[PDB]
Design an enzyme around this catalytic site. Structure first.
Site, PDB file in Angstrom:
ATOM      1  N   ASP A 131       0.994  -0.966   0.092  1.00  0.00           N
ATOM      2  CA  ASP A 131       0.023   0.121   0.166  1.00  0.00           C
ATOM      3  C   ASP A 131       1.089   1.355   0.126  1.00  0.00           C
ATOM      4  O   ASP A 131       0.680   2.443   0.823  1.00  0.00           O
ATOM      5  CB  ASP A 131      -1.195   0.494   1.035  1.00  0.00           C
ATOM      6  CG  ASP A 131      -1.815   0.799   0.918  1.00  0.00           C
ATOM      7  OD1 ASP A 131      -2.155   1.445   0.048  1.00  0.00           O
ATOM      8  OD2 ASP A 131      -2.521   1.445   2.461  1.00  0.00           O
ATOM      9  N   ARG A 135      -0.072   8.991   0.221  1.00  0.00           N
ATOM     10  CA  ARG A 135      -0.450   9.474   1.636  1.00  0.00           C
ATOM     11  C   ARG A 135      -0.197   8.933   2.533  1.00  0.00           C
ATOM     12  O   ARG A 135      -0.505   8.870   4.021  1.00  0.00           O
ATOM     13  CB  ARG A 135      -2.213   9.542   0.604  1.00  0.00           C
ATOM     14  CG  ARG A 135      -2.851   7.869   0.509  1.00  0.00           C
ATOM     15  CD  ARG A 135      -4.170   6.457   0.851  1.00  0.00           C
ATOM     16  NE  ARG A 135      -4.116   5.362   0.235  1.00  0.00           N
ATOM     17  CZ  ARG A 135      -3.774   5.206  -0.788  1.00  0.00           C
ATOM     18  NH1 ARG A 135      -4.259   5.494  -1.818  1.00  0.00           N
ATOM     19  NH2 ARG A 135      -3.180   4.010  -1.002  1.00  0.00           N
ATOM     20  N   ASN A 136       0.272   7.968   1.928  1.00  0.00           N
ATOM     21  CA  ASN A 136       0.894   6.569   3.344  1.00  0.00           C
ATOM     22  C   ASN A 136       2.530   7.043   4.165  1.00  0.00           C
ATOM     23  O   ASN A 136       3.027   6.312   4.029  1.00  0.00           O
ATOM     24  CB  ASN A 136       0.919   4.844   2.912  1.00  0.00           C
ATOM     25  CG  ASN A 136      -0.799   5.042   3.193  1.00  0.00           C
ATOM     26  OD1 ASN A 136      -0.963   5.585   3.366  1.00  0.00           O
ATOM     27  ND2 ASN A 136      -0.756   3.710   1.988  1.00  0.00           N
ATOM     28  N   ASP A 149       1.979   3.104   7.744  1.00  0.00           N
ATOM     29  CA  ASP A 149       0.317   2.700   7.651  1.00  0.00           C
ATOM     30  C   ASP A 149       0.592   1.431   7.304  1.00  0.00           C
ATOM     31  O   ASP A 149       0.825   1.340   6.091  1.00  0.00           O
ATOM     32  CB  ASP A 149       0.139   3.582   6.240  1.00  0.00           C
ATOM     33  CG  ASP A 149      -1.416   3.078   6.522  1.00  0.00           C
ATOM     34  OD1 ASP A 149      -2.166   1.877   6.671  1.00  0.00           O
ATOM     35  OD2 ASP A 149      -2.511   4.581   6.539  1.00  0.00           O
TER      36      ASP A 149
END
Length: 267
Positions: A131, A135-136, A149
């Protein structure tokens, strides 16, 4: 996964939204108080709780300047909490949108180096992230980027995204470091375009179909050709042809120390 007493946790403002993320303070006994990030899980199943806290377990295995630090957890009361270091500048993507055009190419490469070094270390420790997305990635006041994350992470020893995921990982559920490298290429693109959404408003199926027909994201505005080439190298169909994270790190460092190699623009 150090079990923290709730008396030591003071929850301040909400900084984000299956639960919320808060800015907070921490008075460990004997320690100087520090600012923290507090991820909670909405208090209403056992299974959902276990998979929420497992992120902490994996996160607590790492010690690296570009990996998010775990202070500890709260698991014997509700809501359960994962308490991490506080990152002043938030998520990398919205932070670059906030500073559009206002970091130099060298600064941006430095952020990509940090992300790369964090992933090299995660690959070395035998984890697939699964992932990796801007955004992480979280950013502190000195512009150090840290990978965060770890909830979909796999130790190899809601509406789920698709536009950061390798074609082989989408089609056959085959997630590897090599697929993480594909994601790292998308992060690269996300950085050099100052927080644009990958593939813009193309649908999930449009992305999947375009990738299959050998389409690759065009270079962001003012992107150096060498950086665009590394992105392309990261997005090779055959996963064995993609560079490893060690190689990526070394490539970037070569750019860092040879800044004139970043003046030739792709587009």
């Amino acid at each position: 996964a150090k079990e923290i007493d709730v008396s030591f946790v003071k929850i301040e403002e909400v900084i984000g939204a299956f639960g919320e993320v808060y800015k907070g303070r921490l008075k460990l006994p004997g320690k100087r108080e520090i600012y923290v990030a507090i991820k909670t899980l909405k208090a209403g199943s056992e299974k959902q709780r276990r998979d929420f806290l497992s992120e902490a377990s994996i996160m607590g295995q790492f010690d690296h300047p570009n990996i998010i630090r775990l202070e500890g957890v709260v698991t014997k009361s509700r809501p359960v909490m994962i308490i991490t270091e506080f990152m002043e500048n938030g998520a990398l993507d919205s932070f670059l949108r906030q500073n559009d055009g206002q970091f130099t190419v060298i600064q941006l490469v430095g952020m990509l180096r940090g992300i790369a070094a964090g992933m090299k270390y995660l690959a070395e420790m035998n984890y697939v992230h699964r992932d990796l997305a801007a955004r992480n990635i979280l950013v502190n006041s000195n512009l150090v980027c840290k990978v965060s994350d770890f909830g979909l992470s796999r130790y190899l020893q809601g509406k789920i995204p698709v536009r950061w995921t390798a074609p082989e990982a989408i089609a056959y559920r085959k997630f590897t470091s090599a697929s993480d490298v594909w994601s790292y290429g998308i992060v690269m693109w996300e950085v050099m375009s100052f927080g644009e959404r990958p593939y813009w408003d193309m649908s999930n199926q449009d992305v999947i179909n375009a990738i299959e027909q050998d389409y690759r994201l065009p270079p962001p505005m003012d992107c150096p050709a060498a950086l665009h080439q590394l992105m392309l190298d990261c997005w090779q169909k055959d996963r064995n042809s993609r560079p490893r994270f060690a190689e990526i790190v070394n490539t970037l460092d070569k750019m860092i120390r040879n800044p004139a190699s970043l003046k030739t623009v792709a587009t």
